[PDB]
Design an enzyme around this catalytic site. Structure first.
Site, PDB file in Angstrom:
ATOM      1  N   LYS A  30       0.821  -1.211   0.000  1.00  0.00           N
ATOM      2  CA  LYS A  30       0.000   0.000   0.000  1.00  0.00           C
ATOM      3  C   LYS A  30       0.859   1.267   0.000  1.00  0.00           C
ATOM      4  O   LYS A  30       1.916   1.312   0.635  1.00  0.00           O
ATOM      5  CB  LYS A  30      -0.965  -0.001   1.195  1.00  0.00           C
ATOM      6  N   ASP A 128       6.271  -5.001 -16.292  1.00  0.00           N
ATOM      7  CA  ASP A 128       4.832  -4.729 -16.287  1.00  0.00           C
ATOM      8  C   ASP A 128       4.484  -3.238 -16.166  1.00  0.00           C
ATOM      9  O   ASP A 128       4.059  -2.765 -15.109  1.00  0.00           O
ATOM     10  CB  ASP A 128       4.112  -5.569 -15.212  1.00  0.00           C
ATOM     11  N   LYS A 130       2.188  -0.233 -16.483  1.00  0.00           N
ATOM     12  CA  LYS A 130       0.739  -0.016 -16.439  1.00  0.00           C
ATOM     13  C   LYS A 130       0.420   1.478 -16.395  1.00  0.00           C
ATOM     14  O   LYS A 130       1.244   2.268 -15.941  1.00  0.00           O
ATOM     15  CB  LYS A 130       0.128  -0.698 -15.208  1.00  0.00           C
ATOM     16  N   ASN A 133       1.093   3.051 -13.290  1.00  0.00           N
ATOM     17  CA  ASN A 133       2.514   3.266 -13.030  1.00  0.00           C
ATOM     18  C   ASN A 133       3.038   4.532 -13.699  1.00  0.00           C
ATOM     19  O   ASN A 133       4.219   4.857 -13.576  1.00  0.00           O
ATOM     20  CB  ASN A 133       3.344   2.064 -13.498  1.00  0.00           C
TER      21      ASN A 133
HETATM   22  O1  LIG Z   1       1.374   0.335  -5.216  1.00  0.00           O
HETATM   23  C1  LIG Z   1       1.851  -0.092  -6.258  1.00  0.00           C
HETATM   24  O2  LIG Z   1       2.233  -1.377  -6.460  1.00  0.00           O
HETATM   25  C2  LIG Z   1       2.100   0.716  -7.490  1.00  0.00           C
HETATM   26  C3  LIG Z   1       2.424   2.125  -7.144  1.00  0.00           C
HETATM   27  C4  LIG Z   1       1.501   3.121  -7.382  1.00  0.00           C
HETATM   28  C5  LIG Z   1       1.795   4.431  -7.065  1.00  0.00           C
HETATM   29  C6  LIG Z   1       3.016   4.750  -6.508  1.00  0.00           C
HETATM   30  C7  LIG Z   1       3.362   6.115  -6.184  1.00  0.00           C
HETATM   31  C8  LIG Z   1       4.647   6.437  -5.804  1.00  0.00           C
HETATM   32  N1  LIG Z   1       4.690   7.778  -5.571  1.00  0.00           N
HETATM   33  C9  LIG Z   1       3.464   8.327  -5.797  1.00  0.00           C
HETATM   34  N2  LIG Z   1       3.200   9.623  -5.652  1.00  0.00           N
HETATM   35  C10 LIG Z   1       1.925   9.887  -5.934  1.00  0.00           C
HETATM   36  C11 LIG Z   1       0.949   8.996  -6.330  1.00  0.00           C
HETATM   37  C12 LIG Z   1      -0.392   9.488  -6.596  1.00  0.00           C
HETATM   38  C13 LIG Z   1      -1.475   8.643  -6.740  1.00  0.00           C
HETATM   39  C14 LIG Z   1      -2.740   9.136  -6.984  1.00  0.00           C
HETATM   40  C15 LIG Z   1      -2.941  10.495  -7.092  1.00  0.00           C
HETATM   41  C16 LIG Z   1      -4.200  11.000  -7.337  1.00  0.00           C
HETATM   42  C17 LIG Z   1      -4.384  12.363  -7.444  1.00  0.00           C
HETATM   43  C18 LIG Z   1      -3.315  13.221  -7.305  1.00  0.00           C
HETATM   44  C19 LIG Z   1      -2.057  12.717  -7.060  1.00  0.00           C
HETATM   45  C20 LIG Z   1      -1.870  11.354  -6.954  1.00  0.00           C
HETATM   46  C21 LIG Z   1      -0.614  10.847  -6.709  1.00  0.00           C
HETATM   47  C22 LIG Z   1       1.286   7.662  -6.463  1.00  0.00           C
HETATM   48  C23 LIG Z   1       2.600   7.318  -6.181  1.00  0.00           C
HETATM   49  C24 LIG Z   1       3.937   3.748  -6.272  1.00  0.00           C
HETATM   50  C25 LIG Z   1       3.644   2.440  -6.586  1.00  0.00           C
END
Ligand SMILES: O=C(O)Cc1ccc(-c2c[nH]c3ncc(-c4ccc5ccccc5c4)cc23)cc1
Length: 280
Positions: A30, A128, A130, A133
């Protein structure tokens, strides 16, 4: 104790962070929005349980890969402090616009392309790629969420639903369950670009089993309203035979030198000199 590499922080503890909200649950744990108590800045912290694991972390730095600041572990959980990329998911913007214009799409495809090519030079396969990602940063540059977790060592349910699966691009060879080589990333790149131009993934179907059947057996049909260069690239990247696929013989140099990416100065691209077509 599990070996985490050079990024390991023997002093850092969960007690140092203020968790606000859940960012996103993936296959390997998570991700949570956290603000460092002391430093007073926001980090995306990925937590993975140590009971889920069966030379584990290899972080790679790149202008288009998310930056790992440090890592630490408790008795039960592993923590990975990452950059909080706030520009939002690329495909969120795609949905809001139905599809991307070709110069817009080329830009994003080019930034992803370079990052994939760089990893291959270090003998690393993304495996992978996606839409989940792929994110844009505050400025509008591509940021990939993969930071180097050895995925072939994490116990997780990869079970696929009947209708409306999780968006992912499974190459023909991955469906036959053959080992991942570099050329799988090029299929993913091609699929990302296809979706950016068309609005849906290649070979798409509401029925997941029908979708797999298309990927394997149904010829790639590219609709009009995209340029010949775009047409030729997609024909090359979405080759079902991975010995015929674009980037089979010379990898990134085949993509880099493609006519679709003629207008791309790859030196300026990595050096973030080309201003993003869209600003979040
Ligand atoms: O969990 C996994 O396997 C795969 C996975 C997925 C995400 C991330 C991830 C690392 N850094 C991140 N910073 C931001 C965000 C993020 C997410 C949603 C948002 C919605 C609205 C606005 C900003 C948003 C920012 C996601 C990540 C790492 C690994």
């Amino acid at each position: 104790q599990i070996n985490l590499g050079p990024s390991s922080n023997p002093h850092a503890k969960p007690s140092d962070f203020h968790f606000l909200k859940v960012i996103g649950k993936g296959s390997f744990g998570k991700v949570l929005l956290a603000r460092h108590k002391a430093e007073e800045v926001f980090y995306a912290v990925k937590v993975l349980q140590k009971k889920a694991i069966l030379v584990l972390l290899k972080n790679v730095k790149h202008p288009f890969l998310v930056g790992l600041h440090f890592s630490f572990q408790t008795a039960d959980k592993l923590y990975f402090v990452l950059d909080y990329i706030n520009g939002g998911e690329l495909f969120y913007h795609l949905q809001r616009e139905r599809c991307f214009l070709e110069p817009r799409a080329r830009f994003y495809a080019a930034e992803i392309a370079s990052a994939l090519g760089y990893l291959h030079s270090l003998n690393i396969v993304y495996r992978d790629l996606k839409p989940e990602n792929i994110l844009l940063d505050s400025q509008g540059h591509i940021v990939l969420t993969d930071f180097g977790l050895c995925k072939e060592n994490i116990e997780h349910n990869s079970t696929t639903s009947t209708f409306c699966g999780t968006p992912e691009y499974l190459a023909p060879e991955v469906l036959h369950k053959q080992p991942y080589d570099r050329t799988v990333d090029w299929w993913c790149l091609g699929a990302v670009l296809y979706e950016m131009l068309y609005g849906l993934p290649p070979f798409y179907s509401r029925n997941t089993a029908e979708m797999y059947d298309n990927i394997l057996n149904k010829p790639l049909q590219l609709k009009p309203n995209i340029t010949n260069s775009a047409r030729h690239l997609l024909e090359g990247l979405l080759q079902k035979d991975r010995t015929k696929r674009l980037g089979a013989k010379d990898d990134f140099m085949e993509i880099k030198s493609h006519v679709f990416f003629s207008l791309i100065n790859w030196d300026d691209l990595i050096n973030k000199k080309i201003t993003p077509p869209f600003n979040p």
